[PDB]
Design a protein around this ligand. Structure first.
Ligand SMILES: CC(C)(C)n1nc(-c2ccc3nc(OC4CCC4)ccc3c2)c(C(N)=O)c1N
Length: 460
């Protein structure tokens, strides 16, 4: 009796999308314990190692315990998926909390960074390297002000090939250690990344920056950065010294996570100082830019997914309609939706037959439909897809409002440049699209215009 994931857990809702897959909030069917399950599709993510190697790693990770590292509880594998069952954390990304503060200082930075260093040190002792460490991988344990930081995804880079899709790689270039690019790397790459995160926490700007991904990688590969911005005047030599040691090019010369923990700056500023307002302002801008480019690409993706699935669902139902009537019953809509799921394999939310049944019922409950006298498939398809798109279009509007910090309703041509640079959409291409939406415009777009540009950039 091999164990099966859905015999034990039922999905409650989606928490979001991370590296390698979807994260679902799940519940144990017997104990009622809540857990965050990372679902990695074997069809979308290629393994780098053999099965042996990964199971060994999973066994080790289940035995490791540290207050700043996500806790893994269980592991399931079936034909199409791996299921990584872990502790649920409700505090969100670090940077999302930081932008909401009214005050931020070198003491707060230092408390953050020594939580990070402490989880890393621990993991390196057990010979586990993160490699893809960045702000998105730092969650707060709870919505409390005093909440601990938990590092997610320690261990996945060793076993899974990262996505080349830009919707997944957005914002990774700032943090990656030069030696990781060239291919010969060890645990010190995690110190580099942390050194970058500290630079951003104290100034609000990345030390290596650029108008697009490859521009950013060129800076990193040269390894040159400076403290020649005005806001570094507000920051102790001590912190700059730690940064220097963490951003040391040659790894053998770069400080270890453990020796970073014993550095003067950490010692001084994590004991019981000016607010860094410019830093917090730059971070609020940097964060907004990223989340808007991210949401742009996920909107484009959602629209493309939708077209794929509308045509597919329509063809499944046309075929299933042996009458030629355009009328299916509940049990068929379900059979068809399920067969969409067999063919795609994209919904972590539809983890079992019962998750599908309920989704169908939510759709039937939406349309003005007698549910126990059979339904017009055309209209079920419309409501079902919109429902899918909803999360992504609502998020787009929200990331747009949050980016528009002065509530002007508009974003300048200069701001778009930065947004499409980060989203790695060719410059000539988006200017060309901006020309065709509003052919009278004056280098600013509202939300409706911006959205039309995106629809045009994904083939519509
Ligand atoms: C914010 C979002 C990205 C939606 N997220 N993601 C997780 C999360 C992250 C990494 C995980 N890794 C797991 O296993 C690790 C063992 C190597 C990967 C298992 C569950 C995870 C949940 C997570 C959580 N655990 O609460 C959460 N809130």
């Amino acid at each position: 009796s091999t164990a099966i994931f859905s015999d034990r857990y039922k999905g409650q809702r989606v928490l979001g999308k991370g590296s390698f897959g979807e994260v679902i909030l799940c519940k144990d069917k017997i104990t009622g314990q809540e857990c965050a399950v990372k679902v990695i599709s074997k069809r979308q993510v290629k393994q780098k190692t053999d099965k042996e190697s990964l199971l060994r790693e999973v066994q080790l990770l289940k035995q490791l315990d540290h207050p700043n590292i996500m806790k893994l509880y269980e592991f399931f594998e079936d034909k199409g998926y791996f299921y990584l069952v872990g502790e649920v954390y409700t505090g969100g990304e670090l940077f999302d909390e930081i932008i909401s503060r009214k005050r931020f200082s070198e003491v707060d930075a230092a408390r953050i960074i020594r939580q990070v260093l402490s989880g890393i040190t621990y993991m390196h002792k057990n010979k586990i390297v993160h490699r893809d460490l960045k702000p998105e991988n730092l969650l707060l344990e709870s919505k409390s002000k005093d909440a601990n930081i938990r590092i997610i995804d320690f261990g996945l880079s060793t076993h899974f090939e990262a996505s080349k899709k830009m919707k997944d790689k957005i914002g990774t270039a700032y943090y990656i250690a030069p030696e990781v690019l060239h291919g010969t790397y060890d645990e010190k790459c995690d110190v580099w990344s942390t050194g970058v995160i500290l630079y951003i926490l104290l100034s609000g700007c990345p030390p290596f920056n650029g108008a697009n991904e490859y521009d950013i990688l060129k800076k990193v590969e040269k390894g040159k950065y400076t403290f020649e911005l005005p806001q570094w005047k507000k920051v102790s030599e001590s912190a700059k010294d730690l940064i220097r040691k963490m951003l040391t090019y040659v790894p053998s010369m770069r400080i270890s996570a453990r020796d970073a923990l014993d550095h003067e700056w950490i010692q001084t500023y994590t004991k019981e100082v000016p607010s860094l307002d410019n830093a917090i302002l730059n971070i609020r801008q940097f964060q907004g830019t990223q989340k808007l480019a991210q949401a742009a690409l996920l909107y484009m993706g959602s629209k493309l997914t939708s077209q794929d699935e509308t045509k597919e669902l329509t063809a499944i139902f046309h075929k299933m309609d042996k009458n030629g009537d355009g009328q299916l019953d509940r049990a068929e809509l379900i059979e068809g939706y399920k067969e969409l799921m067999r063919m795609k394999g994209q919904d972590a939310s539809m983890l079992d037959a019962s998750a599908v049944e309920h989704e169908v019922d939510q759709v039937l409950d939406a349309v003005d439909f007698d549910k126990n006298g059979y339904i017009e498939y055309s209209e079920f398809v419309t409501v079902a897809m919109d429902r899918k798109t909803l999360l992504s279009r609502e998020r787009l509007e929200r990331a747009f409002r949050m980016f528009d910090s002065d509530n002007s309703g508009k974003i300048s041509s200069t701001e778009l440049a930065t947004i499409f640079g980060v989203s790695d959409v060719d410059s000539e291409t988006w200017k060309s699209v901006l020309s065709e939406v509003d052919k009278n415009n004056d280098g600013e777009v509202d939300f409706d215009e911006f959205q039309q540009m995106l629809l045009k950039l994904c083939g519509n």
